[PDB]
CSV table of C-alpha atoms and ligand atoms in Angstrom, one decimal:
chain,number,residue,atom,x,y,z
A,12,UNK,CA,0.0,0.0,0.0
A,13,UNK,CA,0.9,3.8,-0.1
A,14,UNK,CA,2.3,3.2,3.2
A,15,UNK,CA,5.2,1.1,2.0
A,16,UNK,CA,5.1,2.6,-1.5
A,17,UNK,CA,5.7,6.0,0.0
A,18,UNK,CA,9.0,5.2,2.1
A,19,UNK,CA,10.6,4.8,-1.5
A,20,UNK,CA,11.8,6.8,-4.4
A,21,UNK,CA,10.4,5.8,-7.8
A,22,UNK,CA,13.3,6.5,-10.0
A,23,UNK,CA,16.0,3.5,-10.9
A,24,UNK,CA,18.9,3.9,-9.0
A,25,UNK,CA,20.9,1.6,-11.6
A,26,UNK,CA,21.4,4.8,-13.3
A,27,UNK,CA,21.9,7.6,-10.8
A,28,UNK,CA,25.0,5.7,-8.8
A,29,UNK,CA,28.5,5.2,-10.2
A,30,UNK,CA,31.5,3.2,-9.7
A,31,UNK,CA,30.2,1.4,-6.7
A,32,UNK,CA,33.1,-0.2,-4.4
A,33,UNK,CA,32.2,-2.3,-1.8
A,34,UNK,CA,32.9,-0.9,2.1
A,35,UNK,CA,30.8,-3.8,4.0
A,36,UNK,CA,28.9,-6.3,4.2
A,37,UNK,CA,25.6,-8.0,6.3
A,38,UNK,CA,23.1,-11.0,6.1
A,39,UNK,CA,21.2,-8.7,3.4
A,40,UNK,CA,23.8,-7.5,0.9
A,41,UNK,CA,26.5,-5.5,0.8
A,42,UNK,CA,27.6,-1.7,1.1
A,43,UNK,CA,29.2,0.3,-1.4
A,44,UNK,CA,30.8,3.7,-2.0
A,45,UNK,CA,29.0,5.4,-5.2
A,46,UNK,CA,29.0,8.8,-7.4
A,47,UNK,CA,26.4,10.3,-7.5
A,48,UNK,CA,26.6,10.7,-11.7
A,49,UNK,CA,24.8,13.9,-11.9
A,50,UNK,CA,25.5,16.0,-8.9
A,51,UNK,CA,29.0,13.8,-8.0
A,52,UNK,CA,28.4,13.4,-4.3
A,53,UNK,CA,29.5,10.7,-2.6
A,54,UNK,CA,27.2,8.5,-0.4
A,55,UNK,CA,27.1,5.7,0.9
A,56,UNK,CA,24.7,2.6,-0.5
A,57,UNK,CA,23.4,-0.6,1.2
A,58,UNK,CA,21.8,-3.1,-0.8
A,59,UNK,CA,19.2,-4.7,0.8
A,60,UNK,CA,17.8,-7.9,-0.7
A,61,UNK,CA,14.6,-9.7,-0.2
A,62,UNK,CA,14.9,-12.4,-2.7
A,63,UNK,CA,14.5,-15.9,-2.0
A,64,UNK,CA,13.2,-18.5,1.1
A,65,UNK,CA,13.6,-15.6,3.7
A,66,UNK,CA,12.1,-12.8,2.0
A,67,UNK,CA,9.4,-12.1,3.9
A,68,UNK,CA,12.3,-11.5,7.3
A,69,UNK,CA,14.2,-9.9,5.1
A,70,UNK,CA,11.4,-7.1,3.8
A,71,UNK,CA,9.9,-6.3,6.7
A,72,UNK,CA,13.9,-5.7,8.1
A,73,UNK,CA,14.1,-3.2,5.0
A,74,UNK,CA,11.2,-1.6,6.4
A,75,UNK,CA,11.6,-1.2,10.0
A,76,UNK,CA,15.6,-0.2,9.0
A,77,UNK,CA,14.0,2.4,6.3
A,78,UNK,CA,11.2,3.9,8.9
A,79,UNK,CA,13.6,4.4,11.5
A,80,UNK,CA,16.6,6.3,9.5
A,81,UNK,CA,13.4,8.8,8.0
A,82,UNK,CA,12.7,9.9,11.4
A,83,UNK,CA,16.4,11.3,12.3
A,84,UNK,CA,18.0,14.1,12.2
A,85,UNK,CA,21.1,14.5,14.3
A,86,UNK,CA,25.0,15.2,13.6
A,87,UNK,CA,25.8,12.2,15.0
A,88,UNK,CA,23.6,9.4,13.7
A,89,UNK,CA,24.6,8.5,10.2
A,90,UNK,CA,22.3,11.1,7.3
A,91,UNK,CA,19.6,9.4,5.5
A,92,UNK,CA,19.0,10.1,2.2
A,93,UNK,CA,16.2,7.8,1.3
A,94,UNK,CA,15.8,4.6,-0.7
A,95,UNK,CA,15.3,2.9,-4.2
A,96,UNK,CA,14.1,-0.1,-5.3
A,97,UNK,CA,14.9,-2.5,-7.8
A,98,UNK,CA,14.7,-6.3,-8.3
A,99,UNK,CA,14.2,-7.3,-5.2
A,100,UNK,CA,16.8,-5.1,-3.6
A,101,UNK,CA,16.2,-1.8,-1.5
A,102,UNK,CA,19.2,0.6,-2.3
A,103,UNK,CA,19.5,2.3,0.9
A,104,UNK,CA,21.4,5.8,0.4
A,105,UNK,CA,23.7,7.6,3.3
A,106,UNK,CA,25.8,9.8,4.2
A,107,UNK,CA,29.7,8.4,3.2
A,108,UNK,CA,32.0,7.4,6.2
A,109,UNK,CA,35.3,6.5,6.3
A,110,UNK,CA,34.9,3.4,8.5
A,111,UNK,CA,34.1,1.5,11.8
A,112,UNK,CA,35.6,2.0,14.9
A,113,UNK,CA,36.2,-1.7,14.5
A,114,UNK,CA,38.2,-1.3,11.0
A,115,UNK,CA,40.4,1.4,12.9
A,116,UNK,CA,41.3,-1.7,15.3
A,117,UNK,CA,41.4,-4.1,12.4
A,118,UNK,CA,43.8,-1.3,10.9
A,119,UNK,CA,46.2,-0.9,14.1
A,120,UNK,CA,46.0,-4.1,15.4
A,121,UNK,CA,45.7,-2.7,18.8
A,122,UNK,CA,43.9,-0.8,21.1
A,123,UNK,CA,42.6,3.0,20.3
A,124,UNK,CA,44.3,5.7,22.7
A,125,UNK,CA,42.5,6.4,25.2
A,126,UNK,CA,41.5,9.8,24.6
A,127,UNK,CA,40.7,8.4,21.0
A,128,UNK,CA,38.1,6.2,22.8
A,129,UNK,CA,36.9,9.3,24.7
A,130,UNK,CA,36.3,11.4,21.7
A,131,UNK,CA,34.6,8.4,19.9
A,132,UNK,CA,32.0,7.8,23.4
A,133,UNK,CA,31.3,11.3,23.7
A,134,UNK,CA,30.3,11.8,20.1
A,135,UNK,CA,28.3,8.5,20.2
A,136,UNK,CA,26.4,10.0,23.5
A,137,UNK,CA,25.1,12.8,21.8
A,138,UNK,CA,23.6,10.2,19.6
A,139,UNK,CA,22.3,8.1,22.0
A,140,UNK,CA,20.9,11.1,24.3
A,141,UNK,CA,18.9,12.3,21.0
A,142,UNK,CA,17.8,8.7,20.4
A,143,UNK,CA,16.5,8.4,23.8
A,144,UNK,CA,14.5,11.4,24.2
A,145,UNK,CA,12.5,10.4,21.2
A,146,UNK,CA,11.7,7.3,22.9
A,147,UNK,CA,14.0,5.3,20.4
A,148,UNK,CA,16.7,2.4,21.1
A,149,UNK,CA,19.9,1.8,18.9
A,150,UNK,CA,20.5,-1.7,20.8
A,151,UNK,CA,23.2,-3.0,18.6
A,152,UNK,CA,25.7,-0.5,20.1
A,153,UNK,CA,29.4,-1.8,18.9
A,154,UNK,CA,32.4,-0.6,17.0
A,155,UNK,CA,31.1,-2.0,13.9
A,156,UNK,CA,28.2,0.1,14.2
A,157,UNK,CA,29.7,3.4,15.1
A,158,UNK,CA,31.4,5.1,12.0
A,159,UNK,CA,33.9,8.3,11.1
A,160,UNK,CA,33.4,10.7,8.5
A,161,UNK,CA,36.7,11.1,6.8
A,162,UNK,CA,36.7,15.0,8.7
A,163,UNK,CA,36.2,13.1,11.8
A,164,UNK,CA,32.9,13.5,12.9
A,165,UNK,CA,31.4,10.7,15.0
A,166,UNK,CA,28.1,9.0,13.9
A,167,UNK,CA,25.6,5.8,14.9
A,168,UNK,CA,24.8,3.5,11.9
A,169,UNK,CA,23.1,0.6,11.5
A,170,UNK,CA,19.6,0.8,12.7
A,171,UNK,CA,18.7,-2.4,11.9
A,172,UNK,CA,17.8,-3.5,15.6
A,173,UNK,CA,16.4,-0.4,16.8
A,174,UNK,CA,13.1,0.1,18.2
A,175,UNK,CA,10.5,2.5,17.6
A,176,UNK,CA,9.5,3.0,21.1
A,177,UNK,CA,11.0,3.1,25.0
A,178,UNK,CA,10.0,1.0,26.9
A,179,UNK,CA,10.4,-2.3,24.6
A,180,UNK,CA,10.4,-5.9,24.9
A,181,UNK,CA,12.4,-7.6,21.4
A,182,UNK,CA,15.1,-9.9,21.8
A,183,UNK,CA,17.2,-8.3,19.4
A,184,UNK,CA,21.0,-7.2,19.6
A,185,UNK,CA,24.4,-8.8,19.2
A,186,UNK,CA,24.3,-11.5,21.7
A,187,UNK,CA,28.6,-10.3,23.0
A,188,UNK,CA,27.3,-6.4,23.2
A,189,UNK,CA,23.4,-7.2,24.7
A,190,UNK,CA,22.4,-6.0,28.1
A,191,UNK,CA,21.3,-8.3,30.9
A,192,UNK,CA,17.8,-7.0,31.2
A,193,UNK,CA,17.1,-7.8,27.0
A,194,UNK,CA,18.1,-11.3,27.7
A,195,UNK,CA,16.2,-11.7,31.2
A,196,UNK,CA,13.1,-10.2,29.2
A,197,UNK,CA,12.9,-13.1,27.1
A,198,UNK,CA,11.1,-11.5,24.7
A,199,UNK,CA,8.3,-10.7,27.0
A,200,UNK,CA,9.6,-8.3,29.5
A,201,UNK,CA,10.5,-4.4,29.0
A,202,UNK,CA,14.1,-2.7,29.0
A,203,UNK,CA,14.6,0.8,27.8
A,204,UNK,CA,17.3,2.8,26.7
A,205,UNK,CA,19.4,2.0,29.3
A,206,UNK,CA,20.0,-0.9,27.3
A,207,UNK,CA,22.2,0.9,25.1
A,208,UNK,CA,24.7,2.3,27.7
A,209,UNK,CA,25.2,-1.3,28.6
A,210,UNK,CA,26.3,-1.7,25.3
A,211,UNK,CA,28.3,1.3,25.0
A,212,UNK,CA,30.2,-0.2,27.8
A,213,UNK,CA,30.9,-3.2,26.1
A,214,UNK,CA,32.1,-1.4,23.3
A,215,UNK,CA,34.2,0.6,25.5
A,216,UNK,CA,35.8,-2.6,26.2
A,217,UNK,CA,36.4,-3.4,22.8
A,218,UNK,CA,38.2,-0.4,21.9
A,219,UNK,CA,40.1,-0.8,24.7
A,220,UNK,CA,40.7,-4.7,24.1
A,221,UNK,CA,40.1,-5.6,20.6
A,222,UNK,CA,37.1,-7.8,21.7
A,223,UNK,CA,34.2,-7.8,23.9
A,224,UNK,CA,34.3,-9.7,26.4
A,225,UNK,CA,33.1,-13.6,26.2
A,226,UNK,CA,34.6,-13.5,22.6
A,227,UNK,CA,35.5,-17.2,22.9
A,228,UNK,CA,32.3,-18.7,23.8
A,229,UNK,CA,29.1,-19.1,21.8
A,230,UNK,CA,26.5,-17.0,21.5
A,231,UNK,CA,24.3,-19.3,23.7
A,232,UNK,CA,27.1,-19.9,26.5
A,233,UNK,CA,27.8,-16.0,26.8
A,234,UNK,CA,24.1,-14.7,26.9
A,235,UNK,CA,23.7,-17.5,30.0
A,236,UNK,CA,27.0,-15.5,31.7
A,237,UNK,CA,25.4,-12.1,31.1
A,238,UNK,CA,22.4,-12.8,32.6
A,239,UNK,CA,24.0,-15.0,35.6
A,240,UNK,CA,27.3,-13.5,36.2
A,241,UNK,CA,29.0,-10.6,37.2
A,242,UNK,CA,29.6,-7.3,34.7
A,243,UNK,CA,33.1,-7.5,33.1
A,244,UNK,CA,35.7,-5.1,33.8
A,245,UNK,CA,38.8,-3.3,31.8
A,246,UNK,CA,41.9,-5.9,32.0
A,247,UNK,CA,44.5,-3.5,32.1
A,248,UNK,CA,45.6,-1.2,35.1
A,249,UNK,CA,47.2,1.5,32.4
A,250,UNK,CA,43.4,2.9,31.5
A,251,UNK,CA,42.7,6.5,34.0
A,252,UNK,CA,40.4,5.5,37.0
A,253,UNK,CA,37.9,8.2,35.1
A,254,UNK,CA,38.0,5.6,31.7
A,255,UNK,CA,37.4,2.4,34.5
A,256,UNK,CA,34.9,4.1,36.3
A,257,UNK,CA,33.1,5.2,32.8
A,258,UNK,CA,32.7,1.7,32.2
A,259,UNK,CA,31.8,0.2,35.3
A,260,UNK,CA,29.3,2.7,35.5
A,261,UNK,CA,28.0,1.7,32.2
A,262,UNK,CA,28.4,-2.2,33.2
A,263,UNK,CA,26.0,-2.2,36.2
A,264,UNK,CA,23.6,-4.9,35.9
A,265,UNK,CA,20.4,-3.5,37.1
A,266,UNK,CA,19.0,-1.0,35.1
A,267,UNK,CA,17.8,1.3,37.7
A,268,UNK,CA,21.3,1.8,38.9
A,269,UNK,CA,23.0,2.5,35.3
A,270,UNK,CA,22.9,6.4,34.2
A,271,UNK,CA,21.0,7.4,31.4
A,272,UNK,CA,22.5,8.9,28.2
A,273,UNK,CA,21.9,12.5,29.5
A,274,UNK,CA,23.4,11.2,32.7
A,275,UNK,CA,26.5,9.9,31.4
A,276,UNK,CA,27.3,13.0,29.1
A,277,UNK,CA,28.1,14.6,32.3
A,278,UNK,CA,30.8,12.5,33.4
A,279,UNK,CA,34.6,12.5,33.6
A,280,UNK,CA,35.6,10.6,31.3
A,281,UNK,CA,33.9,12.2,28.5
A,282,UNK,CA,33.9,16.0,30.3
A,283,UNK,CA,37.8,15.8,30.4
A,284,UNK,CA,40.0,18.3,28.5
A,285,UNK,CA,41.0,16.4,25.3
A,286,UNK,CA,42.7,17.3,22.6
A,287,UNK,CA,40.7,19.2,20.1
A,288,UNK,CA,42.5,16.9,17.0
A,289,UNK,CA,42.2,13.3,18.4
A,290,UNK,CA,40.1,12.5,15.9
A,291,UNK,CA,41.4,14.2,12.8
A,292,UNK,CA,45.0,12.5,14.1
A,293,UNK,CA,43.3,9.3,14.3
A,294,UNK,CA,42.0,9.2,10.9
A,295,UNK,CA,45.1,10.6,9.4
A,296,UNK,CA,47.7,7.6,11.7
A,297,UNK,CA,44.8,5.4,9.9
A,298,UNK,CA,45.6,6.1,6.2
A,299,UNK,CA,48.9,6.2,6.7
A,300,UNK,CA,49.2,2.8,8.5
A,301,UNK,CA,46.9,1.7,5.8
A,302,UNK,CA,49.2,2.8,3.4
A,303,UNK,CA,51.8,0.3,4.8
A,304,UNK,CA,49.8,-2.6,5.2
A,305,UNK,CA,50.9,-5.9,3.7
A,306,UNK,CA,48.4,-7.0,0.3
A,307,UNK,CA,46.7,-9.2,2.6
A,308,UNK,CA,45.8,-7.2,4.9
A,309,UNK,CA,45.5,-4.1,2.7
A,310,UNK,CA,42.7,-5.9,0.5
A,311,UNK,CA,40.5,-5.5,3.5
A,312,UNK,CA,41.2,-2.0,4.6
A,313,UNK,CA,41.6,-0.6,0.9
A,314,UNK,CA,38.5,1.5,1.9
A,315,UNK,CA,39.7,3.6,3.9
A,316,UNK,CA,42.0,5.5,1.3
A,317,UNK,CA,39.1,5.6,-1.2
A,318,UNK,CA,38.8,9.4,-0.9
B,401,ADP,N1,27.2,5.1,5.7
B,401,ADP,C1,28.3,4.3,5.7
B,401,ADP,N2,29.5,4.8,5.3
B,401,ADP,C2,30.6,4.0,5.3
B,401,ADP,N3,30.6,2.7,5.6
B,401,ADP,C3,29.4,2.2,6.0
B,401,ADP,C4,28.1,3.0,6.0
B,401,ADP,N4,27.1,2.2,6.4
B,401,ADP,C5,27.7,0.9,6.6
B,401,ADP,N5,29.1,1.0,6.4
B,401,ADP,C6,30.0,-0.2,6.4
B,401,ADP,O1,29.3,-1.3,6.2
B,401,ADP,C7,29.3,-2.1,7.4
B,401,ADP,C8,28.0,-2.9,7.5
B,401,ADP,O2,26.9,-1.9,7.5
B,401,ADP,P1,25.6,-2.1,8.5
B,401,ADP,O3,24.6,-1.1,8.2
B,401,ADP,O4,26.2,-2.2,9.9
B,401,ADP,O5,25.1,-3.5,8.1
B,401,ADP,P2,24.7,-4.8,9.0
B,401,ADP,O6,23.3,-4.3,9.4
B,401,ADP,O7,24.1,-5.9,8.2
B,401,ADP,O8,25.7,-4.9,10.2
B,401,ADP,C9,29.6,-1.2,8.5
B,401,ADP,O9,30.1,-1.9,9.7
B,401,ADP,C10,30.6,-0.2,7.8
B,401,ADP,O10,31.9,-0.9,7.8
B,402,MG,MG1,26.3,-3.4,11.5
């Protein structure tokens, strides 16, 4: 109906987009840097398909993903600029980034700098504090899914687990990154955007440890020690008691005694003097140790010197 007729564009995309280069990939499709051939901006395009035994999943995931990126508007949660259709596949159309937090690990093959993982948590904040006074939830907060513009800015992608509404019940996340309460709700229960800072902890972790915690168990065996077992903790004794007490402020376990977004934009750790070019130093120390990979590794990150 016009209701899912009018979340798309009726022109054929096949034509408007250039010299396409893959940057990623999901269960749908892939994503792509493209031309714009008439204007020559560059965005950012995931193809979405919905052929075959699971299309029925996979088109109502193009929807809720497609509804959700209409209603934002925020500097850092990734610009929308709508959709196109074609043989089975919904050409989603963004705003170009650089890459992941997680390809500038793949890229270094260490931990960020800890005023690196500052910048990158306040910026992704702001995102989450917007979110969550709209009554919206990211949950599938993790360096994969928060990106750089090549200029530096910070911005939330992948909305394809978010809900439209606060207090929620889905079980839905990345089982490494999910909070306690999602799994205890079984489906059934409520969490709210809480559920996010959780994650952002997590992530927190995996900048400052390549991997989340539980990395070497299944997704069944860690979800069991989320819900049963203590919150992790940073490894190292090298991280600032204000980066520790970010996190473990981030890892508590019940809900009503984890800060909010708002909350948490107030703290230390993020407050902090910082540099004001961590990030543009972090993208440039990025090219150039792409620029000395090996081919093997190169091939991977070629993406990142695409502009
Ligand atoms: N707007 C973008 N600009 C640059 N790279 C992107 C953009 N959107 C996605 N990517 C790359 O594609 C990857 C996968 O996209 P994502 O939307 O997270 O898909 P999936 O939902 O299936 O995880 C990202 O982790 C990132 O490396
Ligand atoms: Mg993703």
């Amino acid at each position: 109906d016009p209701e899912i007729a009018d979340l798309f564009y009726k022109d054929d995309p096949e034509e408007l987009f250039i010299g396409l280069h893959e940057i990623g990939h999901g269960s749908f499709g892939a994503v792509y840097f493209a031309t714009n051939a008439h204007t020559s901006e560059v965005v950012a395009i995931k193809k979405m398909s919905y052929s075959g035994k699971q299309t029925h999943e996979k088109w109502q995931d193009i929807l809720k993903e497609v509804k959700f990126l209409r209603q934002l508007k925020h500097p850092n949660t990734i610009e929308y600029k709508g959709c196109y259709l074609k043989e089975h596949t919904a050409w989603l159309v963004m705003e170009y980034c650089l890459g992941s937090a997680s390809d500038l690990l793949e890229v270094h093959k260490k931990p960020l700098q800890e005023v690196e993982i500052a910048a990158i948590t306040h910026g992704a904040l702001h995102g989450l504090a917007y979110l969550h006074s709209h009554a919206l939830i990211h949950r599938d907060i993790k360096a994969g899914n928060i990106l750089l513009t090549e200029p530096g800015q910070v911005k939330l992608a992948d909305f394809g687990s978010a809900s439209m509404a606060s207090p929620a019940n889905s079980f839905v996340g990345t089982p490494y990154w999910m909070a306690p309460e999602v799994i205890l709700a079984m489906d059934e229960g409520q969490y709210d955007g809480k559920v996010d800072i959780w994650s952002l902890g997590i992530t927190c972790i995996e900048l400052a440890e390549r991997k989340p915690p539980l990395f070497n168990m299944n997704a069944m065996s860690a979800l069991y020690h989320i819900a049963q077992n203590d919150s992790p903790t940073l490894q190292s004794n090298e991280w600032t008691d204000s980066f520790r007490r970010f996190v473990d402020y981030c890892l508590q376990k019940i809900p009503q005694e984890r800060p909010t977004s708002a909350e948490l934009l107030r703290h230390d750790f993020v407050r902090r003097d910082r540099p004001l070019r961590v990030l543009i130093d972090l993208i440039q120390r990025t090219k150039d140790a792409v620029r000395e990979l090996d081919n093997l590794q190169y091939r991977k990150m070629k993406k990142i010197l695409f502009q």
